[PDB]
Amino acid sequence: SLNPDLANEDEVNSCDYWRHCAVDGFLCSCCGGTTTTCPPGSTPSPISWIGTCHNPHDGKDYLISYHDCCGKTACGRCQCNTQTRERPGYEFFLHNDVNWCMANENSTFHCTTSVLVGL
Amino acid sequence: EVNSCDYWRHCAVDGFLCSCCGGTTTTCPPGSTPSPISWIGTCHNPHDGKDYLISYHDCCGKTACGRCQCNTQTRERPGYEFFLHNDVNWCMANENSTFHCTTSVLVGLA
Amino acid sequence: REVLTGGHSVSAPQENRIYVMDSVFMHLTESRVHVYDYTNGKFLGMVPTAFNGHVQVSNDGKKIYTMTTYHERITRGKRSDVVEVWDADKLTFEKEISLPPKRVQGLNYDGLFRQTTDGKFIVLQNASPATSIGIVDVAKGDYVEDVTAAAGCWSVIPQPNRPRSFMTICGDGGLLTINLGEDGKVASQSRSKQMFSVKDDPIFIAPALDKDKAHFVSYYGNVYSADFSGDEVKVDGPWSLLNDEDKAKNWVPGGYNLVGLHRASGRMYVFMHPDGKEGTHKFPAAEIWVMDTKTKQRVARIPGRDALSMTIDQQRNLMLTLDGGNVNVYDISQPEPKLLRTIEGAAEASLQVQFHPVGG
Amino acid sequence: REVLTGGHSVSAPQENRIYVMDSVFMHLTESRVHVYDYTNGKFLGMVPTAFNGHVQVSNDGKKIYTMTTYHERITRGKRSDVVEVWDADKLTFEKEISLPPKRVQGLNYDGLFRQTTDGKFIVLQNASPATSIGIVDVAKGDYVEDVTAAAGCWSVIPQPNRPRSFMTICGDGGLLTINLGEDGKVASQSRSKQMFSVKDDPIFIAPALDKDKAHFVSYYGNVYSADFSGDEVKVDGPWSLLNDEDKAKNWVPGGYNLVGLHRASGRMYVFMHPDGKEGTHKFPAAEIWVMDTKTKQRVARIPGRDALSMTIDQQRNLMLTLDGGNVNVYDISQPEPKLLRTIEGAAEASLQVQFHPVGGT
Ligand SMILES: *NC(=O)Cc1c[nH]c2ccccc12
Ligand SMILES: *NC(=O)Cc1c[nH]c2ccccc12
Numbered sequence: 001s002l003n004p005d006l007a008n009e010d011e012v013n014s015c016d017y018w019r020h021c022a023v024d025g026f027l028c029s030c031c032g033g034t035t036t037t038c039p040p041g042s043t044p045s046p047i048s049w050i051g052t053c054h055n056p057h058d059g060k061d062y063l064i065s066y067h068d069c070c071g072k073t074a075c076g077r078c079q080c081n082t083q084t085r086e087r088p089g090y091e092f093f094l095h096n097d098v099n100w101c102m103a104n105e106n107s108t109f110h111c112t113t114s115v116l117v118g119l
Numbered sequence: 120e121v122n123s124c125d126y127w128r129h130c131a132v133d134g135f136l137c138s139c140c141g142g143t144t145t146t147c148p149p150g151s152t153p154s155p156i157s158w159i160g161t162c163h164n165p166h167d168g169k170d171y172l173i174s175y176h177d178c179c180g181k182t183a184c185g186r187c188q189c190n191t192q193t194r195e196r197p198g199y200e201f202f203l204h205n206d207v208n209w210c211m212a213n214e215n216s217t218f219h220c221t222t223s224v225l226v227g228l229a
Numbered sequence: 230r231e232v233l234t235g236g237h238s239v240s241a242p243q244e245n246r247i248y249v250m251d252s253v254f255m256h257l258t259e260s261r262v263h264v265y266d267y268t269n270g271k272f273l274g275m276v277p278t279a280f281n282g283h284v285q286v287s288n289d290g291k292k293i294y295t296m297t298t299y300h301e302r303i304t305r306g307k308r309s310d311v312v313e314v315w316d317a318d319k320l321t322f323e324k325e326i327s328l329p330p331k332r333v334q335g336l337n338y339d340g341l342f343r344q345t346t347d348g349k350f351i352v353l354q355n356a357s358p359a360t361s362i363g364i365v366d367v368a369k370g371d372y373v374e375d376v377t378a379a380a381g382c383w384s385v386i387p388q389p390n391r392p393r394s395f396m397t398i399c400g401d402g403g404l405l406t407i408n409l410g411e412d413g414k415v416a417s418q419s420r421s422k423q424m425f426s427v428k429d430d431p432i433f434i435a436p437a438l439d440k441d442k443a444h445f446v447s448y449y450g451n452v453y454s455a456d457f458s459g460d461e462v463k464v465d466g467p468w469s470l471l472n473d474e475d476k477a478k479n480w481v482p483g484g485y486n487l488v489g490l491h492r493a494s495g496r497m498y499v500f501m502h503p504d505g506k507e508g509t510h511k512f513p514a515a516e517i518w519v520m521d522t523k524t525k526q527r528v529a530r531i532p533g534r535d536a537l538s539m540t541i542d543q544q545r546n547l548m549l550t551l552d553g554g555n556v557n558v559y560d561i562s563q564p565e566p567k568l569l570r571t572i573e574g575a576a577e578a579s580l581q582v583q584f585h586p587v588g589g
Numbered sequence: 590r591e592v593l594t595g596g597h598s599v600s601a602p603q604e605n606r607i608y609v610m611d612s613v614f615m616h617l618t619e620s621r622v623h624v625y626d627y628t629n630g631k632f633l634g635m636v637p638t639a640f641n642g643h644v645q646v647s648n649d650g651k652k653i654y655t656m657t658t659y660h661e662r663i664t665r666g667k668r669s670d671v672v673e674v675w676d677a678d679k680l681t682f683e684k685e686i687s688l689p690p691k692r693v694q695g696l697n698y699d700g701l702f703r704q705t706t707d708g709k710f711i712v713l714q715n716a717s718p719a720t721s722i723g724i725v726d727v728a729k730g731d732y733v734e735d736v737t738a739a740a741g742c743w744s745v746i747p748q749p750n751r752p753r754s755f756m757t758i759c760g761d762g763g764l765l766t767i768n769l770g771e772d773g774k775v776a777s778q779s780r781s782k783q784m785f786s787v788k789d790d791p792i793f794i795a796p797a798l799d800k801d802k803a804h805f806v807s808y809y810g811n812v813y814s815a816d817f818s819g820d821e822v823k824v825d826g827p828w829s830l831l832n833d834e835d836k837a838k839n840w841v842p843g844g845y846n847l848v849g850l851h852r853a854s855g856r857m858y859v860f861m862h863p864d865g866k867e868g869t870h871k872f873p874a875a876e877i878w879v880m881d882t883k884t885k886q887r888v889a890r891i892p893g894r895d896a897l898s899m900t901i902d903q904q905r906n907l908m909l910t911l912d913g914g915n916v917n918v919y920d921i922s923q924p925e926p927k928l929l930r931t932i933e934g935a936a937e938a939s940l941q942v943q944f945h946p947v948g949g950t
Contacts, residue, residue, distance in 0.1 A: 002590070021508075032624070032634035038595040040634045041680035047358055067593040071304055073619050073637045076255050084508040088434050089335075089383030090398050091427060092358065097485075098335035099281065102356055107334060108280065108304045109257060116590045130868075141240065141264070141274035145231045149274045150320035153233040156718055176233045180664050182259050182277040185615050193868040197794050198695075198743030199758050200787060201720065206845075207695035208641065211716055216694060217277075217640065217664050218617060225231045256616035277664045302659055304637050305682060322665060 001057035002116060004035040015080035019064055021053035023080040024096035025112035028069050030078035035113050038069035042110040045070055048100045050093055051085045053114070063117040070101035072110040124189035126223075128173055131160030132189040133205040134221030137178050139187030144223050147178035151219045154179055157209045158202055161194050161229050172226040179210035181219040189221075238318040239273045241266040243290050246273060246585040247549060249556060250284045250337045251576035257281055258303060262295070263576060264320070267549065267558050267584075270572040274320045281334050283341060286317060287367075288348035290586045293317050294367075296332055296342050296353060312351060312365050317585070326370050331357040337581035339486055339540075340384030340434055347392035350413050352385045362397065366413045373413040379405055388457050389440045396443075396455065396462065398434055402427045404455050404462050424464035425453050433482065433510070437490035437497045437522075444490065444522060446470065446482045446499055448510050452525075468525045470499065470518065481505030483512040485580045486538035489548060491561055495522045498541070498548055498561070500533055513537055513552060519564055529565045542584045551575075551582045598678045599633050601626040603650055606633065606945035607909065609916060610644050610697045611936035617641050618663060622653070623936055624680065627909065627918050627944075630932040634680045641694050643701060646677065647727075648708035650946045653677050654727075656692055656702050656713060672711055672725055677945070686730050691717040697941035699846050699900075700744030700794055707752035710773050712745045722757065724773045733773035739765060744794045748817050750801045756815065756822065758794055758805075762787045764815050764822055784824035785813050793842065793870070797850035797857045797882075804882060806830065806848055806859055808870050810841045812880075828885050830859065830878065841865030843872035845940045849901035849908060851921055855882045858908055858921070860896055873897055873912065879924055889925040902944045911935075911942045 004012040004019075011017060013030050020027065032039035045068040052061050087094040101107045120126055122139045129136065141148035157176040164171055196203040210216045239246065249263040262276040262284045276293055278284065280303075283296040293315040300306045310328040315321060333341050333354040341354040344367075351365035355375070360383060364374035382399035393409040393416075402423040410416035425432050430451055436443040442456040445466075453466030471480055480501050482488075489498040500514035514533025521528050534557055536550035546562035556575045559566040575582075599606065605626040613620050622636040622644045638644065639657040646653055653675040660666045670688040675681060693701050693714040701714045704727075711725040715735065720743060722736035742759035753769040763781040770776035785792050790811055796803040801818035805826075813826030831840055842848075844860040851858070860874035874893025881888050894917055896910035906922040916935045919926040935942075 030632065032599070032632055033597070036591045036593055037597050038593065039680075040597055040599050040678075041636070041675075041682075043595050044593040065593075069593070069595065072635065073304060073621060074255055074257050075635070077632060079254075081511065082508065083511055086508075086510070087427075087431055088398075089354075089356075089360075090381070090400050090434070091431070092356070092360065092381075092383065097338070098333065098356060102331075102334045103358060106300060106305050107298065107308065108300075109334075113593060115593050118590055139272065141272055142237070145233055146237050147233065147235045148320075149237050149239050149318075150276070150315075150322075151235065153235050174233075178233075178235070181275065182261055182664060183615055183617050184275070186272060188614075190871065191868065192871050195868075195870070196787075196791055197758075198714075198716075198720075199741075199760050199762075199794070200791070201716070201718065201741075201743065201760075206698070207693065207716060211691070211694045212718060215660060215664055215666075216658060216668065217660070218694075222233050224233050227230055253616060256613060256619040259616040259618045279663055299662060301661070302685075303639055303663075325662075 001055050004029070013078050015082055018055050018057065019053050019062070019114040019116060020080055021082055021084035022049065022051045022064070022066060022086045022096055023082050023112055023114060025068065025080065025109065026075040027078035027080060028111035028113040031075035031111040033069065033111070036115060039072070039075070039111065042069035042072045043104060045100050045104055047103055049096050053084060060119060062119060065115045065117055066096065066100065066112055067115050068100045068112050069110045070104040071106035071108055073108055075111040122187055124187070124191060127162055127165055128223040128225060129189055130162035130191050130193035131158065131173070131175060131195045131205055132191050132221050132223060134177065134189065134218070135184040136187035136189060137220040137222045140184035140220040142178060142220065147222070148184070148220065150181060151178035152180045152213055152215070154209050154213055156212055158205050170229040172229050174224040174226050175205065175209065176222045176224055177209040178219045178222060179213040180215035180217055182217055184220040239264065239320060241271065241273055243317070243585045244587050247556070248284060248286060248583045248585070249551070249575045249579050250282070250581040251579045252281060252337060254578040262293070265556070265572055265575060267547070270570060276315055276320055283337055285342055285344060286583065286586055288344060288346070288586050289589065291317055294351060298332065298334065314367070324370050326365055326372065328363060328372050329355070329375070331355040332363070336485065338384065338434060339581065340386060343385040343387055343395065345393040345395065345409065346387055346389050350393060350409060352387070352395055354384060362407070364409060364413045374409070374415060376407055376415060378407070378415065378418055384434045386436045386438065386443055389438065390457065396457070400427065404464065406457070406462055419461055421455065421462040421464050424455060424466065430467065433487055435486050435488050437488040439490055439492055444497060446488055448481065450481045470520060470527070478503045479505045481509065483510050484514060484537040485511065486540065489539050489541040491541060491546065492543050496520065496528070496561070496564065497522050498539060500536055500539070517550070517566065519566070531566055538580045538582065540583050544587060547584070549582050549584070551579060553578060553580070556582055599624065599680060601631065601633055603677065603945045604947045607916070608644055608646065608653070608943045608945070609911070609935045609939050610642065610941040611939045612641060612697060614938040622655070625916070625932055625935055627932070630930060636675055636680055643697055645702055645704060646943065646946055648704060648706070648946060648949065651677055654711060658692065658694065684730055686725055686732065688723060688732055689715070691715045692723065696845060698744060698794060699941065700746060703745040703747055703755065705753040705755065705769065706747055706749050710753060710769060712747070712755055714744060722767070724769065726773045736767055736775055738767065738775065738778055746796050746798065746803055749798065750817065756817070758792070760787065764824070766817065766822055779821050781815065781822040781824050784815060784826065790827065793847055795846050795848050797848040799850055799852050804850065804857055806842045808841065830880060830887070838863045839865040841869065843870055844874060844897045845871065846898035846900065849899050850882070851901055851906065852903050856880065856888065856921070856924065857882050858899060858901065860893055860899070877910070877926065879926065891926055898940045898942065900943050904947045904949065909942045909944070911939060913938060913940065916942055
C-alpha cells in the first residue's frame with residue numbers, strides 16, 4: 001500500500017490512488033518520472049501543500065507532501081483535481097489552487113506528486 | 120460563408136482565418152500587425168468564373184487565434200517556389216514573428 | 230484592389246464586451262484573455278498573457294490590466310513579474326510595471342488581482358510563499374507599497390463605498406481592512422472580530438459584494454457577512470442556505486468564483502450541488518440557487534449547467550456562468566434567471582469571466 | 590519516509606527512444622519534444638522548445654539539438670533565434686548558440702534542421718524571406734556564416750557518403766551541392782543539371798535517402814533520383830510509381846515527411862491516396878506503398894492509417910508513421926510491413942517523429 005514503485009502503474013497513475021487525495025495537477029508518475037522522482041530535467045519544489053489521506057489498504061492515515069516538479073512546461077498527462085481536506089488560501093499550506101513551484105529558480109509548472117512523509 | 124475554409128478566396132490558407140479572430144478578410148484583429156510579405160495563391164471565383172490573385176498576408180505579434188483553422192492547398196508549392204509556399208510563417212520578417220491569423224487579400228485578376 | 234491594414238479598434242461597443250481569462254492550463258505559458266460580445270457570441274479579439282496571466286478591466290473602462298510572469302528563456306533565465314497596461318479598444322500594449330518576483334501564481338479567483346474603487350491603484354496578491362498585498366500606482370506605473378500587515382491573509386475584496394479601501398480574509402477567520410492614502414501607501418487599517426471558524430466552517434473566498442457589505446458562503450452551506458457601512462467592519466453569521474429537505478440530500482456550495490450579488494434586489498446567486506461531503510467544494514453546479522439576502526431564504530433554483538464560475542452585471546441585470554469552456558448568459562432582471570444563450574468554446578480552461586465596466 | 594529528488598536520467602535505454610516533435614500549433618509558443626519508448630508506448634520525458642521548435646538528435650546519440658525563437662516578452666521585445674544543446678540522457682539544457690534572426694519558422698520537415706555526416710556542423714534553413722543555409726559549429730558553439738550560394742533553394746539533404754557535404758533543391762529544378770571546409774565555410778560547390786520541371790512535375794522536398802543517392806517523389810506520382818556517388822551529382826527521372834490501374838484511380842503521393850528508404854533492400858516507402866488532383870498533395874495516406882527502387886515495381890500496399898509523416902530506422906528495420914497525434918510502429922524487415930502497435934496521443938500536432946540513433950557509423 002505504501003510502495004507505489006512495487007504497484008501496478010495503472011493503479012498509481014489514477015487520480016483515485018489513495019495517496020493522491022489533494023492533487024491539483026499532472027501526476028509526475030505519468031510524465032516520465034515516478035511518484036518520488038521528478039521527470040528528467042525538472043526540479044523538485046522545496047515547498048508544497050500538505051495534508052493527510054486515508055489508506056484503505058491498511059486502514060491508517062498518512063501525512064502527504066504534494067511537491068511539484070518544475071522548470072519544464074506542462075506535462076499534460078494524468079491531470080487530477082482531487083480536494084480531500086483542501087482549504088482556501090487563508091490556510092495556505094493546505095491550498096492547491098496555487099503553483100507550488102512559485103519559489104523555484106524557474107517557476108514553470110511541470111507536474112505534481114504525493115510524497116509520503118509518515119503516519 | 121467567409122468564415123468557412125471552402126470560401127473561394129481561401130484556396131491556399133494554411134492557418135486561422137482572421138475573419139473569425141475579431142478581424143476581417145482585409146483587416147487584422149485589433150493589436151495584431153500585418154505582415155509586409157506573404158504567400159500568394161490563384162483562386163477560382165465560382166460566380167464570375169475568373170481566376171484571381173490572392174495575397175495571404177498574416178497578422179502577427181499576438182499568440183495563436185485558434186479559430187477557423189484551414190489547410191487548403193490549391194496551387195501551393197514547396198519552398199523552392201517560396202512565394203507559393205504555405206508551410207512557413209509569413210510573419211517571419213515582422214518585428215514580432217508570433218503568428219496570430221491568416222488573411223486572404225484580393226489583389227486582382229490573375 | 231485590397232490592402233491589409235492594422236491599427237483597428239474592437240468592432241463592438243464596450244458595453245457588449247466580456248473577458249474570458251483562458252489559463253490554457255495544458256499550455257499554461259500561453260494563457261490569454263479572449264474578448265467576446267455577450268449579445269451574439271462573436272469573438273472580438275484577445276490579449277496574450279504568457280504564464281498563468283490574471284486580468285481585469287479598469288473601472289473607467291479605458292484600459293485592460295494583466296499580471297503575468299516572464300523568464301528570459303521561459304523555462305530558464307531571469308524572472309520578471311509584471312503588470313501590463315493595455316488599451317481597451319485597440320487591444321495594444323502600452324506600459325509594463327515591474328513587480329517584485331512574488332506575484333501570486335494560481336487559479337483565477339477575482340480576489341487575486343483587483344483595484345481600488347476610484348481605479349487609481351491596482352491591488353494584487355503576493356505569495357513567496359509568505360503572503361502580502363502589493364499596491365501599484367497606475368498613473369505613476371510603479372509598485373509603491375507592500376502590505377506586510379496582510380501576512381497570513383488572502384485575497385482582496387474592494388469596498389465599493391470608499392475610494393481606496395479593501396479587505397482581506399485572515400488566518401484568524403476575521404478581516405483586515407486597508408485604507409490607502411492618495412499616494413498608495415497604507416493610510417490606516419483595522420481588524421474585525423472573528424467572522425467564521427477556519428477549522429469548523431471554512432468560507433469560500435469569493436464575495437457576493439454589495440456597495441457597503443459583502444457576503445460569503447461556506448463549505449457546509451452557511452452564509453457570513455462583513456458590513457463596512459462604517460469605518461469598522463461588523464461581522465455576522467452563520468445563517469444557512471439550506472432548509473430541512475435541502476439538508477436531507479446534503480446540498481452544499483461548490484465552484485471557484487461561485488457567488489454573485491444583484492445589488493438592486495439583494496438577490497445572491499450561488500452554485501450548489503447535492504451529496505456534499507469532504508472534497509466536493511470545487512464540484513460543478515447541479516443548480517444555481519437564488520437567495521433573498523434580506524429574508525435569508527431561497528426564492529428560486531435553476532439548472533446549473535455544470536458551471537464553476539460566474540459574474541454579474543448590475544446595470545443590465547445579467548449573470549454569466551462558465552463551466553471551464555462555455556459561457557452562459559442569463560437575464561436576472563427578475564428572480565428566476567432566464568438563459569439567453571451559450572457561447573461554446575469561449576476558452577479551453579477558464580475559471581473567470583468578467584464584463585466590461587460601464588458604471589464609471 | 591520519502592523524498593522527491595531530481596537529477597535522474599531517462600528510464601529506458603537509448604535504443605528504445607523516439608522523439609515526437611509536437612508543434613502545438615494551437616499554442617505554438619509552447620511547442621515541445623515528447624520522448625517515448627517505441628517498444629511499449631511509454632512517455633519518458635520532454636524538451637521544451639518555445640515558438641515553433643525544430644529538433645534532431647546528434648549523430649553520436651549523446652545530445653538533442655533544438656532550434657527555436659524567443660522574444661524578451663514573447664509577443665514583443667528583442668528576438669533571439671537559437672540552437673540549444675541538450676543532454677539526451679538527462680534531458681537538461683547545456684548550451685545556447687546564437688543565430689541571426691532569420692531561422693526558418695515553419696512545419697517540421699526533416700530537411701530544415703540537419704547536420705553533416707561527421708556530426709561537426711549543424712546545417713539549417715534560413716528565410717528572411719530571402720533564403721540561405723546556416724552553418725553552426727557545434728564544438729565551438731558558433732554560427733559560421735550564411736551559405737548565400739543557396740539563395741532561391743530550399744532544405745538540406747546531407748550526403749551520407751561524405752563527412753561535410755550536403756545538397757539543396759533549387760528553383761531551377763536542380764540540386765546545389767555544398768562541401769564545407771574544416772572551419773564550416775564553403776570550400777567548394779557544384780550545381781546539377783535540371784532534375785525536375787518545377788512547373789510541370791514538382792517534387793516533394795522529403796528525400797528517400799541512401800548512402801550515395803537520394804530519390805524524390807512528385808505531385809503526380811513520378812520518381813526522380815540524384816546520384817552523388819561520383820564527384821558531381823547525376824540526376825535522372827521520371828519513372829512512375831503508378832501502373833495503369835493506379836493511374837485510372839488517380840493515385841498520387843500526399844503528406845509531409847512522406848517518404849523513406851530502407852537502404853539495405855532498396856525499398857522506398859510512400860504515402861499515397863486516390864482521387865488525386867490539384868490541392869491534394871498534403872492529404873493523409875489512404876495507403877503506404879512499398880516500391881523496389883531497383884525493379885521500379887510496387888512490392889506491397891497496406892492501409893495508411895491517415896498517416897502524414899514517417900521515419901525509417903536502418904539498424905532495427907522499422908518504420909514509424911504519424912497522423913498528427915498517434916505513432917504507428919511497423920516491422921519492415923520483409924517487403925510487406927507488419928504493424929506492431931499504435932502509440933495514441935503522442936502529440937497534439939506533430940508532423941515529425943525520429944528515432945534515437947543507434948550505431949550508423
Ligand atoms: N499543484 C500545483 O502546483 C499545480 C497547479 C495547480 N494550480 C495551478 C495554477 C498555476 C500553476 C500551477 C498550478
Ligand atoms: N501561413 C499561415 O498563415 C499560418 C501557418 C501555417 N503553418 C505555419 C507554421 C509556422 C507559423 C505559421 C504557420
